[PDB]
Amino acid sequence: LINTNGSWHINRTALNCNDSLHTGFLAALFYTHKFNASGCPERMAHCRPIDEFAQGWITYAEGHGSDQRPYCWHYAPRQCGTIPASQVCGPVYCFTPSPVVVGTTDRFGAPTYTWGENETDVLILNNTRPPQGNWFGCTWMNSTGFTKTCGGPPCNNNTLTCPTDCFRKHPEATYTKCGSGPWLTPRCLVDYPYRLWHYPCTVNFTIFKVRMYVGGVEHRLNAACNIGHHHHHH
């Protein structure tokens, strides 16, 4: 089908990437730098760490957000249904939460085998919550050399948009209900093979095994979480 579970796609990814730019993002696939060796804290200082000056007073907000890098858990990702295949560089991982791969498909749904080279190739991914089908949201790397993200709408002298978690800042808002991207909590990621290439500033995160229940089904998953500076168990 359009999606593929079990951590095995075949080749039908979009092999369209760029080489003019000298940034060498593709060349940065063999190795990753240290936390402080790549100037992360400049790019990590633009979002509020723990408690975002809010209390509260269930609804969904469309709004918008299209500009800033999705490198920390604050975001308002938009809804994406179809994307041209000329822009995609690498697998497009979508989160059930369990990672799943979507491959290039023709307009009418016919699978195509061209490594994404042919012009007409597109990707159909109608972001939708698993309770109604499909995946919460998902991520890939654009051809020009920058990460992208997309997903469902955030739910409900300061402001707070919650794309995930916000347990204490909402009447028990959970991932199964409001989760959009791979951010299970403010400091946890849904680990997948290419995680270190789309989020290279989470290299220092430690590994973890987790169990989750969404709707009426159960998912066994491996997550990545750093040393949270308050507590391990809640």
């Epitope: 951590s7 095995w8 796609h9 075949i10 080749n11 990814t13 092999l15 990437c17 060498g24 593709l26 060349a27 940065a28 696939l29 063999f30 190795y31 990753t32 730098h33 240290k34 402080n36 060796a37 690498g90 697998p91 093979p193 290419y194 270190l196 290439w197």
Partner: antibody, heavy 111, light 107 residues
Framework: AEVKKPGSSVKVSCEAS????????ITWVRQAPGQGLEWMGG????????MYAQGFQGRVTITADESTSLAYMELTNLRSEDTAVYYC????????????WGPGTLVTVSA | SYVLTQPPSVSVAPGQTASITCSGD??????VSWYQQRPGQSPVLVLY???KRPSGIPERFSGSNSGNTATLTISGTQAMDEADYYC?????????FGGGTKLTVLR
């Protein structure tokens, strides 16, 4: 072993993905007798793009076949300096440490 | 050009602690790796990412990296720890192997 004539070409082969997820990166390291290790290049089954070292920019060519699930480097115009043992390593995808160094292949040329 | 330097040889007596140094420019900002190679055998990983050791390596091995030096430390050295040790790092989209250091134990 059998000595390769100077100016000829040799091939070094390795196992590779058959057209599915790999989750590893391949690399080639040459060791002259008692002279240490030298890198040549790396290859990613998922992205066919290779990566060659500077010193050997003009003589190495890395290519892979998916039907045979085998990726090899061709080295051309061997000289007296290119007698050595070749190791083929397979490391994790994005951690940059090579593990499971495979059996070495010796290549000799006669001045 | 990027080049890493190590001492040529180190000699220790059994039961003592041996230290091997891999040096470079601002090496502390890199993820160094260590390989152990016996004569005529393919090298095997002994330390990756400074202090993270894989499974199957005895607890005697240890490592650290700071400033301009990465130190591989062995405790309780014995006759099965004589070998060549190599230091690996990444720079400028190129791999760099440090000069091998031969560890020999005086019987």
């Amino acid at each position: 072993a059998e000595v390769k004539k100077p100016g000829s070409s040799v091939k070094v082969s390795c196992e590779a993905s058959g057209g599915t997820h790999s989750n590893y990166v391949i690399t080639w390291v040459r060791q002259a007798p008692g002279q240490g290790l030298e890198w040549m290049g790396g290859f990613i089954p998922d992205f066919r793009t290779a990566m060659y070292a500077q010193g050997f920019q003009g003589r190495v060519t890395i290519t892979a076949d998916e039907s045979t699930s085998l990726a090899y480097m061709e080295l051309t115009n061997l000289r007296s300096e290119d007698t050595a043992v070749y190791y083929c390593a397979r490391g994790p995808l994005s951690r940059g440490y090579y593990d499971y160094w495979g059996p070495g292949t010796l290549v000799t040329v006669s001045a | 050009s990027y080049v890493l330097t190590q001492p040529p040889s180190v000699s220790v007596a059994p039961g003592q602690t041996a230290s091997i140094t891999c040096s470079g420019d601002k090496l502390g900002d890199k993820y160094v790796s260590w390989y152990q190679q016996r004569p005529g055998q393919s090298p095997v990983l002994v330390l990756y990412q400074d202090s993270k050791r894989p499974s199957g390596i005895p607890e005697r091995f240890s490592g650290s990296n700071s400033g301009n030096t990465a130190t591989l430390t062995i405790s309780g050295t014995q006759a099965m720890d004589e070998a060549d040790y190599y230091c690996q790092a990444w720079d400028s989209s190129a791999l760099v192997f440090g000069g091998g250091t031969k560890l020999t134990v005086l019987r």
